[PDB]
Amino acid sequence: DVYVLSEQQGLLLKALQPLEEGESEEKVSHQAGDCWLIRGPLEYVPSAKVEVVEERQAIPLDQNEGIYVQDVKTGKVRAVIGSTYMLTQDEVLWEKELPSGVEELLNPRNKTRVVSYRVPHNAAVQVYDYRAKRARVVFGPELVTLDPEEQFTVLSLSAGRPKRPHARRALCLL
Amino acid sequence: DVYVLSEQQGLLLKALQPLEEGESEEKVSHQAGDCWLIRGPLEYVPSAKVEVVEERQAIPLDQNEGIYVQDVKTGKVRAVIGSTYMLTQDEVLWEKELPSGVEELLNPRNKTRVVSYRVPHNAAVQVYDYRAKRARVVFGPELVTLDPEEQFTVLSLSAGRPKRPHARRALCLLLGPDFFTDVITIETADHARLQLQLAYNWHFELKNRNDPAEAAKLFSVPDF
Numbered sequence: 001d002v003y004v005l006s007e008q009q010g011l012l013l014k015a016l017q018p019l020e021e022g023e024s025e026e027k028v029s030h031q032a033g034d035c036w037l038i039r040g041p042l043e044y045v046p047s048a049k050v051e052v053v054e055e056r057q058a059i060p061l062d063q064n065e066g067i068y069v070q071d072v073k074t075g076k077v078r079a080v081i082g083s084t085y086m087l088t089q090d091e092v093l094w095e096k097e098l099p100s101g102v103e104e105l106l107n108p109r110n111k112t113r114v115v116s117y118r119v120p121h122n123a124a125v126q127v128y129d130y131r132a133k134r135a136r137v138v139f140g141p142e143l144v145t146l147d148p149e150e151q152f153t154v155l156s157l158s159a160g161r162p163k164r165p166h167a168r169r170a171l172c173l174l
Numbered sequence: 175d176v177y178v179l180s181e182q183q184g185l186l187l188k189a190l191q192p193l194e195e196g197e198s199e200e201k202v203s204h205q206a207g208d209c210w211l212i213r214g215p216l217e218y219v220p221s222a223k224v225e226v227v228e229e230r231q232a233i234p235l236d237q238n239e240g241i242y243v244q245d246v247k248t249g250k251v252r253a254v255i256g257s258t259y260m261l262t263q264d265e266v267l268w269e270k271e272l273p274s275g276v277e278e279l280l281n282p283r284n285k286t287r288v289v290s291y292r293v294p295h296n297a298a299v300q301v302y303d304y305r306a307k308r309a310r311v312v313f314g315p316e317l318v319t320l321d322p323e324e325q326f327t328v329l330s331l332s333a334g335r336p337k338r339p340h341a342r343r344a345l346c347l348l349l350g351p352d353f354f355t356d357v358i359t360i361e362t363a364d365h366a367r368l369q370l371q372l373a374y375n376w377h378f379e380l381k382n383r384n385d386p387a388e389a390a391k392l393f394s395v396p397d398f
């Protein structure tokens with residue numbers, strides 16, 4: 001059956017054979033050794049010169065929330081948020097991870113989606129950028145969305161009648 | 175049988191075949207790979223070029239009450255309230271959820287319908303927007319309907335003869351005159367310890383319902 005498909009659906013199409021600039025709907029040249037995604041509310045059939053790869057699907061999203069991506073080629077990684085967004089021909093989900101900052105963050109998860117943390121208006125937190133090296137801060141009643149490389153600057157509050165620094169931890173500053 | 179159907183009923187219609195701009199009642203073009211809902215007090219039969227999908231039905235509603243929706247495409251989410259409203263061709267119910275704020279809210283549920291909370295006239299609550307980042311406040315004898323992303327700013331009241339902050343929780347702020355008792359020990363300069371039972375009359379002033387900033391003062395304290 002012809003691959004009729006919704007715009008939400010997508011198909012990467014690796015080619016076993018060299019250029020297809022002719023008789024393609026896009027007329028675009030396509031050398032072997034690299035290929036492309038196809039999507040849109042339309043029917044499609046594989047050409048003899050090209051093979052189907054995978055059924056990447058819609059990745060629904062709303063504002064101030066999203067998922068990480070990274071190019072296989074250049075290797076650059078970035079978060080993306082807001083509009084619904086499928087991986088393109090090369091981008092892939094990337095696994096962000098934390099140095100035991102997660103359980104406090106909660107106070108099972110697909111880490112590939114961008115991590116975020118609601119900040120109480122009294123609270124404030126630090127994020128020391130390791131990319132542009134531009135550390136920055138939030139202060140107010142709003143959620144915060146990390147760049148994947150930007151680790152939190154967690155603080156170790158003192159606690160108890162004796163003031164022991166190790167006694168408690170809280171990323172937020174009340 | 176022909177799909178005769180009430181306006182309340184609806185049918186999404188995915189097409190297996192390309193454009194149907196011809197001989198359609200709407201004359202509208204319809205490329206394959208994306209499709210549309212059909213509804214209205216009318217009979218309908220599927221075309222050979224298109225297949226039936228699902229029987230989405232009426233979603234009855236009244237004023238100041240409704241349900242969440244989100245586009246599969248743009249991914250934008252919004253509450254809708256008031257008039258009865260079926261999901262369109264792409265919109266779908268979305269699952270709002272809370273950080274254990276629910277049981278207090280009650281003081282089993284389909285979370286996809288918009289959550290709401292009646293507010294007693296003495297009571298007031300905060301909602302710190304995470305979308306437009308426009309935090310806002312209610313104060314009066316009226317129900318409140320959240321934007322799905324707008325979490326409550328729950329407060330942790332102190333309780334007991336000792337004043338322990340962790341002891342109680344209440345999203346509402348009963349800011350009326352109702353005096354609260356307090357017990358604080360003290361000692362005289364001559365080293366004579368003594369206990370005290372001391373009531374506190376109290377109330378929050380409000381120059382205007384109109385000014386958000388005074389409410390920002392009301393919520394500025396973690397625990398007044």
